[PDB]
Design a protein around this ligand. Sequence first.
Ligand SMILES: *[C@@H]1O[C@H](CO)[C@@H](O[C@@H]2O[C@H](CO)[C@@H](O)[C@H](O)[C@H]2NC(C)=O)[C@H](O)[C@H]1NC(C)=O
Ligand SMILES: *[C@@H]1O[C@H](CO)[C@@H](O[C@@H]2O[C@H](CO)[C@@H](O)[C@H](O)[C@H]2NC(C)=O)[C@H](O)[C@H]1NC(C)=O
Ligand SMILES: *[C@@H]1O[C@H](CO)[C@@H](O[C@@H]2O[C@H](CO)[C@@H](O)[C@H](O)[C@H]2NC(C)=O)[C@H](O)[C@H]1NC(C)=O
Ligand SMILES: *[C@@H]1O[C@H](CO)[C@@H](O)[C@H](O)[C@H]1NC(C)=O
Ligand SMILES: [Ca+2]
Ligand SMILES: [Ca+2]
Lengths: 536, 536, 187, 187
Amino acid sequence: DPLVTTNFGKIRGIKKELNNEILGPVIQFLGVPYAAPPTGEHRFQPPEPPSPWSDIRNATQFAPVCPQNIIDGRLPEVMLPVWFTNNLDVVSSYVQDQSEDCLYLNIYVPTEDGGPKPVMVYIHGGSYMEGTGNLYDGSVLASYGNVIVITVNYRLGVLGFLSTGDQAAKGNYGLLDLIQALRWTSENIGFFGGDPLRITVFGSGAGGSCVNLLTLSHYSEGLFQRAIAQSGTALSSWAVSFQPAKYARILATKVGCQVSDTVELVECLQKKPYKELVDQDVQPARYHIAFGPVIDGDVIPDDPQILMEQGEFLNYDIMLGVNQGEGLKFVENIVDSDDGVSASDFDFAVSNFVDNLYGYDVLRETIKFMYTDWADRHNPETRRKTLLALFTDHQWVAPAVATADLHSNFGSPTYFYAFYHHCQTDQVPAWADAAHGDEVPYVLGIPMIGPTELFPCNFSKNDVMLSAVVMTYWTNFAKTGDPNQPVPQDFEEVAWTRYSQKDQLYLHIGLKPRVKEHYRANKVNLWLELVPHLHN
Amino acid sequence: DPLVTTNFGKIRGIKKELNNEILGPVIQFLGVPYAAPPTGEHRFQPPEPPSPWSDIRNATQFAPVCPQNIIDGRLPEVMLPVWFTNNLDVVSSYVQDQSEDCLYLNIYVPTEDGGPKPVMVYIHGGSYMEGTGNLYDGSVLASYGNVIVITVNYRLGVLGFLSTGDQAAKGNYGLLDLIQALRWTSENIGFFGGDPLRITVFGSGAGGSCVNLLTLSHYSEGLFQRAIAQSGTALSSWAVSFQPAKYARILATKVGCQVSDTVELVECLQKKPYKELVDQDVQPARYHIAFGPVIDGDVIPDDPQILMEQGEFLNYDIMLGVNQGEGLKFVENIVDSDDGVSASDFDFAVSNFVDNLYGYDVLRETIKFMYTDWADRHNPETRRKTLLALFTDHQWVAPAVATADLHSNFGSPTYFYAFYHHCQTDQVPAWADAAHGDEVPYVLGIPMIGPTELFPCNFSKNDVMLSAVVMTYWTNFAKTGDPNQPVPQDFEEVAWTRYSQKDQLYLHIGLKPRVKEHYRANKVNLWLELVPHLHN
Amino acid sequence: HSAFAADPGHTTYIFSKGGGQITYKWPPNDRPSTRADRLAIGFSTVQKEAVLVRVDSSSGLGDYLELHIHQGKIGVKFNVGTDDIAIEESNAIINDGKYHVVRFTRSGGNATLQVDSWPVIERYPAGRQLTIFNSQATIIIGGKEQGQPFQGQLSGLYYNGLKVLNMAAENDANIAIVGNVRLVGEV
Amino acid sequence: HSAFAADPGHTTYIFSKGGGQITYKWPPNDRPSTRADRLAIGFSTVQKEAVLVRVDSSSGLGDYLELHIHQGKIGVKFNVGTDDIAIEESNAIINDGKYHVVRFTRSGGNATLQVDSWPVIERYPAGRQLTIFNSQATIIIGGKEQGQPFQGQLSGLYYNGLKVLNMAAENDANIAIVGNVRLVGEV
Ligand SMILES: *[C@@H]1O[C@H](CO)[C@@H](O[C@@H]2O[C@H](CO)[C@@H](O)[C@H](O)[C@H]2NC(C)=O)[C@H](O)[C@H]1NC(C)=O
Ligand SMILES: *[C@@H]1O[C@H](CO)[C@@H](O[C@@H]2O[C@H](CO)[C@@H](O)[C@H](O)[C@H]2NC(C)=O)[C@H](O)[C@H]1NC(C)=O
Ligand SMILES: *[C@@H]1O[C@H](CO)[C@@H](O[C@@H]2O[C@H](CO)[C@@H](O)[C@H](O)[C@H]2NC(C)=O)[C@H](O)[C@H]1NC(C)=O
Ligand SMILES: *[C@@H]1O[C@H](CO)[C@@H](O)[C@H](O)[C@H]1NC(C)=O
Ligand SMILES: [Ca+2]
Ligand SMILES: [Ca+2]
């Protein structure tokens, strides 16, 4: 039996062998508490260190996840990864078991047959409302790349992000949870053979957002050294909550609280059964979030755009990227069995879109103009392409570029990719490119095993190769802060060149891998340079 | 000895054989007076019919041209045909002989070895200030296509377009001259074998403008039936004079008149020696004209844009088109021996341009954005290309499209071409595409002879073929109002399809002639649909 | 040698029960636009409701001219761009079975209707209107496609110089007779 | 087991006539950015003007830290984004040829300078300033490239945990000694 001693006690893992006879099994420590339960008086408070035990602790099963509601809730289909939206039956099973006491992480440690390994800590996130690290099996990544992989569970939704804009409830509890998790990791991962000076934090979607947010925070100073944000930034409309007080108030009201003083407000919620808080439906503006990270003058000292613009963040090795057709769900339901979009629905889509994002006609006109193919403007297939590209460009591509531009500008080694391949399911239209969340199975090395309940795609032979390529890039980055060094690609002249504002080189990731320049330079500059000139 | 009897007397022509032994010679009647001298009391008055003579009149030499000043004048090089600006030494010779008594036309009649032929009437025009029909030898066109070709002389500049916005001087004299010339033609060309029911009016540059203006005038009713406007519309900034009174005043002032009453203003100018009026330098706004056609609620009943927009014009067969690099002269002198433009000069050019055309920054920014290649925005060669395209698109391509759009919308058979080949001279940079005025030698069938003093280019073998193709299309249009009917192209599937707002089919005229759809639809629609929404 | 001013009759056509239709059509390459129009029609009928002639613009254009009978009173309704304009002889009735000549005249926005020698109806606009009838495509004599077929006789139809019925009695390439229409000759 | 407060010396480098320069260089993939900086340097000189150390940001960035002598008074001048900030010990003089330890301290816009035990000079801002020194590229001990080479001795140079001169006496892969610079040992 595999046992490790931590600063809090002894824990017993479990062995696990993969459905692939080329990969050496791993030992996984599941449900390791990295913090005291955030219950009762510690609700809406920063996390505290875990209590120690004079015992051999069993870390062989997942602990209950943080309270959430994915069925009768709202479920922001545009924000969520497609693989998650498409089978929430299998997702539900990961989340059937919930508890407020939910601050646990999972360790995946490889198996040799010399030297502290890199640690890759995965932060999940759909919309800040739901999810678990448990949905992500770190086994293959750990075994293939010889790195320790940790997946974390942090407070979600109300319990993780309630804020009054005051000292009553300051918010960002879920972010502090991630900091605490990284503290525990930094000072306890050596016992597992991990390297506290080579921790790489990584995440997709709102997970990416967390990653970026953490790099703006002076709390993560000395806790991790590199970051990978996948289809996620701190600059998207749904990255932070700009009106937390308003929604705290609405939530308080909905569960029968005196919304008078903010202290009496929190005190009221402090005491309610979590289910009351979770089962409540608080709808924010279209492409915005109600309960999420907040500008608190502390963890997040100011608007990420300002901080980033001013270089008020430390040096990290950064890797970020986007998928080809991130915004599948924005268009999916507006299509018409002929795989096309009417010139009518288009105007609506774009008009509504600009309304929600920008407000109260030159901009609406400019965007309609910019996203119309004047060669065959009657092609209704083209209309869905450019409509999908509009959402992908706005919500993902332009913020990623801005992020890459600003990190690299201020000296941080930056690598940028664009993901251009996926495994198509029957759950997705055949005309769809790589949707949101589609990089994940490759990164998790799922093709190395073949279809699982979670990712049930029939991974081809090329999917396995791609995954190995991706995993080599990611683990190389984790090892050296360079996706090229150690393990080479056996990609001759195909070396992931570092991104900078001059040529803006990025890696086209697909069955025909290439390194190009200025990804979608026209639209990116539209949104990043020209669209600002049309404001008041 | 060829003689013809006209309603005014008998005239003797002269025979002319071409420097090509495939073309049957022509008889040309030169300096045929189509109206009484517009002198003395008839200055700043509509033209009157010519006096009759009991005599055999010699029409064997060009009459003096209308008074103009092309040397120490301003010479709007952007407006003028490149072939004209590049050798005005040869041009000057055509214009050495001037007189206010200058209302004469020139007839080119073919020679057989049965049925009234079509008549092509050519209206010249650089900036409305200068030129002659004499510059254009109609011989080859007449001989190759079996059509009568007439080239006309009409009053120019002040004498031709002075207006006070009053009844003192109502303006548009040069336009009335063209009407009168077409009256004379309609009732006298039968005597030469011409067909009064098959008159095609055609012109390039400001000539094209005249053509278009005439089709908006109810004076041209029943006088001609088809029109070809080449690099010329009634919608460009320099097509009509919108502040004639202002410039009549400045002119009056400059020659020592009492600018008090408008009647005493015209009286003063009525009496001055024409040289005083011609040698005067009245500079209008950059891309505008001081003395030119005028909205007088008569000949030109209203803003051409309005009239065209409301379909307040009769049915004509229309052919119109543009050249690939019309705006050569806008960029030529801003280039830097490396054939490139600095990002510095660019901003200026575009800023200055938008200032002149639009006034008193979202438009300035949108235009700069739209005309930047965000792929290599540092490529200074590309910078000159798109800068050239900006002027070409604005001053020529957009107006032409708008015109084709509106004529076709209201039922007029419409044919659109884009000219994409030329004969490069040493006088023009080698990177230059077809500039303004470059289609002319092809249409005039100059390659059929080889270099002349006026067009001294070394016409290749392909130039002769193109000319024959162009001339076939033009005369086919003159014959039937369809560039396809009679003489076929020996261009299998290469049939010039009719232009309509649906597909907007146009004929690419090059060595590789093809018909395509929606010429530069991105930039055209930028200027036609989107730029309007950026005005107040 | 034809004139607006002449009686347009005398090529007499019988539009009997079941309906009839005579159609003149201009070639797509020569459909006329006009600033003024001159229509003269000689007819006789007893009907309460019918549509005699209709001139229609090309496709995608709303310009048209319609001459019709409604409640025994002859009238015209046309559109040259702005909106529908109406003019009708209401002072009296014309479906009494005898021969009549109705004249309609258009000058941009101005219009005119006269029934024989009765008082010319004038329809002036209190503001400038569009002046042009854009590319005329067909003349449709009969009013069948409008679901109000005409029943009676037409001796002549003058339109802008065209003697349309006479051209039909000359089997002109552009005339198409369809339905219950006979060209009653003479003797 | 280093401390900013503990004496930074005792690696005694002589910077004699003709000038000298010791330079530490961070790998381009690991140039640090810092919200706070602690510099402590032990030295001795008689010069009226010299530039002892200067930390410079990567290319295309204006962030830097410069420790220098001007008119016998030690001082610092730095920039973290906004503009140049200056702080100097003017109460007295330090070029008397004896050993001194000047400490400089930065907290965002806040700064600190002390010469030995003398009164800590404090330079507070009347408004929030930028707080981060972006990607530190090189430490340039000597001031030669600035055209004011230092002449005298340096027993130690502590910079944000780094014992710069000690690392040079350990032939550390990152240290580059160039010019009139001797590592005077002991005995
Ligand atoms: C850890 O889990 C083990 C396995 O379920 C538990 O130990 C069992 O209970 C006692 C404790 O040793 C023994 O009698 C059984 O043999 C154990 N099961 C086996 C075979 O492992 C126990 O609940 C946990 N460990 C403790 C004692 O805290
Ligand atoms: C995904 O897997 C299915 C099997 O579940 C593949 O189907 C194969 O062929 C038929 C059709 O379903 C089945 O009876 C076989 O059992 C399947 N073969 C096996 C064992 O894989 C199907 O081709 C795959 N989907 C695609 C086309 O990507
Ligand atoms: C027209 O120009 C001709 C060209 O010379 C003139 O003709 C000369 O004069 C008469 C014309 O009637 C002829 O008999 C002579 O032979 C001509 N001279 C020669 C030898 O060239 C004539 O003057 C002009 N036409 C008229 C008569 O007005
Ligand atoms: C072009 O024309 C000139 C005469 O102007 C001639 O001498 C020269 O050789 C020609 N170039 C060629 C050979 O095409
Ligand atoms: Ca009309
Ligand atoms: Ca800084």
